[PDB]
Every structure is written in C-alpha cells, then in structure tokens.
Nucleic acid binder design. Structure first.
Ligand SMILES: O[C@H](c1cc(C(F)(F)F)nc2c(C(F)(F)F)cccc12)[C@@H]1CCCCN1
Ligand SMILES: [Mg+2]
Ligand SMILES: [Mg+2]
Ligand SMILES: [Mg+2]
Ligand SMILES: [Mg+2]
Ligand SMILES: [Mg+2]
Lengths: 146, 185, 201, 51, 60, 180
RNA sequence: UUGGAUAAGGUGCCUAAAUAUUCGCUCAUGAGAUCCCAUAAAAGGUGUUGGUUCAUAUGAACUAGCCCUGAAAAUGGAUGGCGCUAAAGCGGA
C-alpha cells in the first residue's frame, strides 16, 4: 500500500538525529594512529565499540574501535551486515561515495588543508601573490563603488 | 542501558500542538499552555500530517525511561487541559462554624473567613490563569478550574494549606476544605 | 597563550576547571580578562552549592573578622578567589600572575569590542552529563546576597541588542566583500586564478 | 454537624495514613517505606492511630 | 520459622553471623538423599538424635 | 596497528604433568586454557590451578606444552558467556556474565574491567571458570540481547576526542556537542 | 660535577608530568580521594548497580559494590588548598 503524498512529508520531516552509526556509514577517524582517515562501519561490537574498515582505497585495516574515536559523516552506502572487505571496496567504488564526500563542504575543506600542508614555499608565495592581486582588484572595485 | 525507548502520545482532534526544543506549546479551546522539558535529554517529535506525538530516548537507565514516561504523562495532561478545563471540586467540611468563602478579583484570590471562629481573614491567591468558582448545585463545594492540570492542583493545595488547623487533635477536628473530585468540565 | 590579552567569555563554563585553565596561563605569562562572570556554572546542585558557600562564610576569624577570610560574594570576585587558590600567590611570581588576571561581571567598556574566547575543555556542555544538577553562579551569588543581579542581566540584554545591530552590519560587509571577490576573480590572471581556486581561496 | 460522606472525606486526608516508626512522618496509607532520608528510608511503618 | 528464629537470635550475638540451611538430614553427617538411601537398604541405626552407620567391620 | 587500544591478555593452552616416580611410572597429564597477560604468567596460573585441584606443585611436575592460542576469526562479533568464581571482602561467589566481543581475549579483558568496576573485584580474586560462545537463542542477559537486534541503528551522542594537536585551550566559537 | 635513564610516587592547577586513552561503578539537603595516618560500628535502606537461588515477565528471597541513614563538642577550617561530578571520586586496564 502506497503513501501518495505522505512520502513527501516523510522526506521533509526534521529529524534531530541524522547520521546513525550503522553498517555502511562513512566515518572520519579522529583519534589514534589513524586520524583524518575515512573508514566504514562494518559490524558493531557493543554500545561503545564498533568494527570499522577503511576500504583498501584508504590506509586503515579492519579493526575494532571505540565509537568515541569516530565522527559520523553524512554519507552512507547500503551493505549486507556480514560484508567482507573486498565486497565493501567493490560497493563503495561503484557508488562513488568518496567522490561525493570530497564534493561535500567538509571533505573539500579537508582537501584544502592537505594541500596547504603539502605546499612548497614557492607555491605559498604564488598563493600570496594571487591574494595580493585580488586585494588590489578588490580595492579598486570598492573605490569605484564608493 | 537500553538502546531505544519510545512513547506515543496521541493528540486530540481540536488541539494546536507546537514544539521546538522540548519547549512544548499547546493551543486549544480554553487557552494556551507552554511548558519546557529541557531538563531531560529527550528528542520529542511531532507528527502533524497524522495524529500523535512521539517521545523517544536513546540509551539511559530505567531512570531515563521513567523520565520519558513522566514527560508523556505531562503532555497528555496538557492536551486534556487544552481540550477541556480541569475541574477540581473542593468540599469544605465544618464541625461548628460555617466557613465563609468569598471570591474576588475576577474569580482569583479566595478569601476564607470564620474558620473555627478566629475572626481573621485567610488570603489565598490562585496561580496564573486559574478560575475559582462556588457551588451552583450543592451548598459547600468550590470549583478550581483552568486548563493547566498542574496550576489548578497547586492552587487547590494552597487553599487546603490555608484552611488546615494547627496545634490540636487532627483526628477530632475534621474542619477544612478538601479535594473531593478531580474531573474535567 | 602568546596573545597580548585574552578575553574569556565565562558563560557556559564550569567554574573550577575554568579557574584551573586560567591559572596555568597566568603563570606562563598571559593577561586574562574573565568577562561575563555571572553565567559561570558549578557542577553541584544549586542548594548544595549554597550550603557550601554558607559553610565557607561561617569560617571567619574568631578574634577580629576585619582580617581573616574575606567572603567576596560577587561572581567575578568568587572566580578571582578561585583562581588565586590555584596559584602560588604568596610568592612574587604568583602575585604578578594574580595581578595579570582581571575579572568582570557582564561586559564593560573595552571588552565588548574585543574577541571573546571560550575554553572548550572547561565547558559545562562538554564536562557534565545532562542528567546531573548544575548551578548558575549569578543565582548562587544572589542567594548569598549580591543584589546587583537583575541590573546586570538588564545591562547584558541591552548590550545584546547593540551586538545584534553591529552583527547585522558585519554580515552585510562580509556579503559585500564576497560579491567583490566574485566580481574580481575574473579580472585577475587565468593561471593565478586557477592557483587561487586550487588553494581554497 | 459533619455529614457522613464529608466526614469520611476528611478522614481520608487526616486519618487514614501510615506513620514512620522512626521519624513520625505522615505517609500514604499504602506505603512500604519512609521516604524521609533521616530514618534511611526504613520499612518500619505503622498505621496512623485511629482513636 | 526455624530460619526466622535463628535470625532473631543472631541479633544478639556480636560480629557477623549467617543463617545456613543444610542439605544434611539433621545433625547427622549425611545428605538427605544419602540418608534416605541408607534407610532403604538398612545400613543405619538410629539411637537418639545421633545415628550409627554400619561400617562392615565388627565381629558377628 | 594501534598500541593504545590493545589489552595484552592472551589465551594459552598449557599442558603439564607431575614428574614420573618409580612408584607412579605413568602419571596423568592435565591440560587447560588460561587467560593471562604473558606466557610466564599463564604458566604460573596453571601451576596455581594444579595446586588447588590435584596433588601437584611446580617443583614436582614439568610443563609439557605451552601454545598461545590466537582467535580464529578476530573480526567476527561473537556473544561470549563467561562463568567466574570471585572473592569479596565478605566471602566467595559464583557468577555468570555475558560479553559481546570479537575475541575470547577481548571478552576476558572486558570482564576483568567489569568485575573491577562493579564489584571492586581485583584480578587476583577472580577465577575464570569457562568462556564459551553462546548462540543468539540462548542469550540470557538483556544488555546483549538488545545488541543482537535485527537492523540495529543508533546515533552517536559521544563527545569528540580531538587529537592533542587540534586540542587547544582557547577556542574561537563555542563548540557544539549536537553534531548531527 | 655534566648528561642520561629510572625508583617510590605522581601527571587539573598549586606542582615537573596526561583536563591521556580505555571499560565500569557512584549524586551525597554535611560525597569521595591511596601503606603507616591521623577513625568509625551493629543494624537498616522499594537509592541505584550487578549477581545467586527459586517460583509462577511479574512475585519472592537472598547476595555483594558503590551510595545513603545510623554519624553529636566545643577558635574558623581543612582529601594539604583551591576545586572536582562525560571527576581532578572509587575499581581496574
Ligand atoms: O571550598 C568551598 C567553596 C568556597 C567558595 C568560596 F570560597 F569561593 F566562596 N565557593 C564555593 C562554591 C562557589 F559557590 F561556587 F563558589 C561552590 C562550592 C564550594 C565553594 C567551601 C570552603 C570551606 C569548606 C568547603 N566549602
Ligand atoms: Mg643528574
Ligand atoms: Mg624520564
Ligand atoms: Mg605542570
Ligand atoms: Mg566549589
Ligand atoms: Mg591530583
């Protein structure tokens, strides 16, 4: 039996708790040897511990972690509970979830940060120069407006 | 610890329910009631398309569940109030001296005179938004009414306190106003 | 703690922890202005806190109360006292550190235009479970005779309006800046523009 | 002059309660414990003495 | 009732005591079931309170 | 590999027997799994148990074998039932607790913590009598039953544990515990 | 004497070192806080947290942790102080 127009309501009904820890949630590891790394929730051990797996695209092996060490992302991909690592890899690649994540604000900012970190002095200088140029132009525009 | 605990509070027909952050506000036939619940961790949610409102609590011991239940009950009470005024019938029993009950200031501030014959005036003011009426049917009873199930109750309690005697045998001196019936209009 | 003067917004903080945080910084060599001290929270139930305060008050010097424990009942004053407690104030360095601290109720003259900082490891929202009883410091102060609470609140409210007004203007300015940036990104140089894009800006 | 029903009602409040054998607290007539902290919530309850 | 009595008594001793219901038959050092079994094959003679167990040792 | 998360409790199969004597040429060999932090500790535990049970002491017996058993499927959630004997300040008690974990060792580690926390029972005072994997039809403890739920889902209410790099005592704007 | 690495103990600040991580347990209208050590008990507790034994998802009885009562002295007042409750308490790892 269908909903007809209740579907819309369901879609747009504010839920206080988005991002549930559950199989196939994206997840940014915050604390430990692995941090800033992405990793998917495979199974769940207890109310406090979960098994994560960073699909061989990511560097992080299947392992148990405290949920406290994870920050849930808006991303999810439907997966069978008992899904092995290979299967996970297959699915995520297919769905292009990583790309989506990157596109998203947080992912973008992370990537920017990474770029900043990895930059050469010259590159930094180039950026500075660009900024200066923009400021000049911006200043001119402001003057014109005035 | 119990992962998920839920309680469904069915809303009546002619009730305008409005929640945000545990600050529930209900509009009805007999006034608007606002009562915050932001002292317990609860993600209460509306269902405006259909009926009912859902109170859900994640994790937490039995205490949490109890709290949730209490909240639900409160909500129900509020709904009831909005639909219909909460009638608190208060009968005053006297052994010798008839209790002179005088209502003033728009059915607020009930003045109690000649209790046990002390010739003094007992002043008891009603809470915000609660009407106090006298008997149209019998000879003694006093109606305490007005939306909020809580406020009315409080008022009644206050009235009772104002009445009750002091340093004498309470089993012999049964004089005073007492809550006879807890009903709705 | 390498800034000239840190202004700390004391609202939503947990007292003792906040004090501790302050003290170390002071010792290191940092000018701290603890601002808006009426809204500092204590982890005990309000009544318990009140009782404790009363007890403290009771311990005065028996011979001549002109000396001994001065029971300063202003929230800011209380905070200051707490800070002092966590310091070697009997030496010279400690004294200096103490002096460096400045406490304010609400927000006064210069500390409305200065950036207000928050200590996240001391916040009530991050240090207390939400089923435990907490106590606002201002309320406590009022209970143990401070009087100037309502006035303070009023002042705060007044300030808020001003802040809002200022905030609107700021927002507008930001928007304008953004617009300008959008306009001018096409007026630079291609490669440079690309580079800029790459590095987030 | 106390009409029976009224009297009964009065009793309901003033008389038909329990009492803590330790701190004398007036308790509901169906209570199992003291409710008061000083007796350490004793289970030692007696009925309110009638007449 | 016995247990209750014991508990009451305990209220009067010093230190820490405990009421302990036994799987024994009663003062006799045999489990109830064991005692029953013995009775069934008649390897036990009851005197007064205490009972003797035939050990297969004495002369005829 | 994480070195902050790990609990160094392993399981060891130990086999030992009393030294043969002229009067008892063919002694009886005893085997057990023992949960302990290192191999020597495991051995010691085994010896203690032998002492408790049979007439045997380390001085008149010999260890035949010590294995160290690794979990076969260290990434499969399993529901563990455990039986314990523990000593309180007031006396001695038997008990059964259940722990959902990914390895026997992990379960044991959990258990030790639990006993320490809930009963103030120190490691010395506990004797693990059997841990076995319980099927989901025989789960008796509600805190494990709940987990065994079908399409289980829960939000994340835990407070962020930032790295001591991005942990700063001065913050710009008041952080948010809500997240999402 | 210099440099190193520890011991006992600690690592919120005083106070050098964790507002470390990890799993529990505690809320106290006179919490608790580490050998000697600077006190607390019998008896309770429909406080909560585990258990055990029973009975027909309730009713029992018990049991032990923390907590509460029991817990009253004289200058003011002392986990060393400040404080601390998603502990900076108690039991661990
Ligand atoms: O340390 C406690 C205490 C003191 C003072 C202070 F000295 F600043 F007024 N304020 C306290 C507060 C306060 F009210 F938040 F300031 C709460 C709890 C205990 C306090 C007192 C001191 C005497 C013995 C224990 N209670
Ligand atoms: Mg040296
Ligand atoms: Mg060293
Ligand atoms: Mg230091
Ligand atoms: Mg304090
Ligand atoms: Mg310390």
């Amino acid at each position: 039996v269908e909903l007809t127009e209740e579907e819309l309501y369901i879609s747009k009904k504010n839920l206080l708790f988005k991002r549930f820890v559950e199989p196939g949630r994206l997840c940014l590891i915050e604390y430990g040897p692995y941090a800033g790394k992405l990793c998917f929730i495979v199974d769940i051990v207890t109310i406090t511990r979960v098994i994560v797996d960073g699909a061989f695209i990511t560097g992080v092996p299947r392992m148990v972690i405290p949920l406290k060490r994870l920050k849930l992302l808006k991303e999810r991909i439907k997966i069978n509970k008992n899904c092995k690592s290979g299967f996970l890899r297959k699915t995520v690649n297919s769905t292009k979830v990583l790309e989506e994540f990157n596109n998203s604000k947080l992912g973008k900012k992370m990537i920017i940060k990474k770029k900043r970190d990895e930059a050469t002095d010259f590159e930094r200088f180039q950026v500075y120069f660009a900024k200066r140029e923009l400021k000049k132009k911006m200043t001119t525009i402001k003057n014109k407006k005035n | 610890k119990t992962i998920v605990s839920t309680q469904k509070v069915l809303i009546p027909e002619g009730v305008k329910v409005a929640i945000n952050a545990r600050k529930v506000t209900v509009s009805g036939k007999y006034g608007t009631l606002r009562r915050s619940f932001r002292h317990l961790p609860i993600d209460i949610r509306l269902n405006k398309l259909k009926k009912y409102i859902k109170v859900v609590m994640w994790f937490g011991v039995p205490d949490s569940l109890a709290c949730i239940r209490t909240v639900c009950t409160h909500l129900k009470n509020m709904f009831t109030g909005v639909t219909k005024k909460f009638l608190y019938k208060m009968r005053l029993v006297h052994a010798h001296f008839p209790i002179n009950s005088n209502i003033v200031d728009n059915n607020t501030r009930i003045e109690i005179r000649n209790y046990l014959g002390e010739k003094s005036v007992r002043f008891v003011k009603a809470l915000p938004g609660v009407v106090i009426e006298k008997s149209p049917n019998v000879k003694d009873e006093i109606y305490v009414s007005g939306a909020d199930i809580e406020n009315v109750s409080l008022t009644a309690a206050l009235i009772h306190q104002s009445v009750l005697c002091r340093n004498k045998d309470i089993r012999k001196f049964l004089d005073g106003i007492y809550v006879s019936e807890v009903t709705t209009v | 703690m390498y800034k000239k003067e840190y202004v700390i917004d004391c609202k939503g903080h947990l007292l003792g922890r906040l004090a501790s945080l302050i003290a170390k910084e002071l010792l290191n060599g940092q000018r701290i202005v603890a601002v808006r001290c009426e809204d500092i929270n204590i982890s005990g139930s309000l009544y318990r806190n009140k009782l404790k305060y009363q007890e403290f008050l009771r311990l005065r010097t028996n011979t001549n109360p002109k000396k001994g424990p001065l029971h300063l009942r202003e929230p800011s004053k209380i905070l200051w006292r707490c800070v002092r407690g966590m310091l070697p104030h009997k030496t010279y360095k400690g004294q200096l550190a103490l002096k460096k601290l400045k406490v304010c109720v609400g927000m006064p003259y210069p500390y409305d235009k200065k950036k207000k900082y928050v200590l996240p490891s001391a916040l009530r929202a991050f240090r207390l479970k939400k089923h435990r009883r907490y106590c606002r410091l201002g309320t406590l102060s009022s209970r143990v005779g401070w009087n100037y609470d309502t006035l303070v609140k009023k002042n705060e409210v007044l300030r808020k309006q001003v802040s809002k007004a200022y905030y609107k203007k700021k927002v507008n300015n930001l928007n304008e800046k953004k617009e300008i940036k959008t306009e001018a990104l096409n007026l630079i140089n291609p490669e440079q523009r690309q580079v800029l894009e790459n590095f987030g800006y | 002059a106390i009409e029976p029903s009224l009297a009964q009602l009065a009793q309901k409040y003033n008389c038909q309660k329990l009492i803590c054998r330790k701190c004398y607290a007036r308790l509901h007539p169906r209570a199992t414990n003291c409710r008061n902290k000083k007796c350490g919530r004793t289970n030692q309850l007696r009925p309110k003495k009638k007449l | 009732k016995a247990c209750e009595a014991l508990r009451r008594a305990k209220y009067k001793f010093p230190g820490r005591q405990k009421v302990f219901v036994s799987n024994k038959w009663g003062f006799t050092p045999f489990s109830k079931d064991e005692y029953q079994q013995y009775k069934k094959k008649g390897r036990i003679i009851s005197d007064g309170v205490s009972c003797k167990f035939i050990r297969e040792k004495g002369p005829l | 590999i994480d070195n902050s998360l790990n609990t160094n409790i392993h399981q060891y199969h130990i086999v030992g027997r009393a030294i043969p004597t002229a009067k008892d040429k063919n002694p009886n060999v005893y085997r057990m799994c023992i949960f302990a932090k290192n191999d020597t500790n495991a051995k010691s535990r085994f010896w203690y148990f032998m002492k408790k049970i049979n007439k045997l002491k380390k001085s008149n017996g010999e260890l035949l074998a010590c294995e160290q058993i690794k979990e076969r499927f260290p990434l499969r959630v399993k529901n563990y039932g455990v039986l314990l004997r523990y000593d309180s300040r007031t006396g001695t008690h038997n008990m059964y607790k259940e722990f959902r974990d990914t390895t026997k060792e992990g379960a044991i580690a959990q258990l030790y913590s639990e006993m320490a926390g809930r009963h103030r029972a120190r490691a010395s005072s506990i004797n693990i009598i059997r841990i076995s994997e319980i099927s989901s039809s025989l789960v008796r403890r509600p805190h494990i039953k709940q987990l065994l739920k079908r399409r289980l889902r829960f939000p994340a209410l835990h407070l962020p544990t930032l790295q001591k790099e991005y942990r700063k005592k001065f913050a710009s704007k008041r952080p948010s515990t809500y997240r999402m």
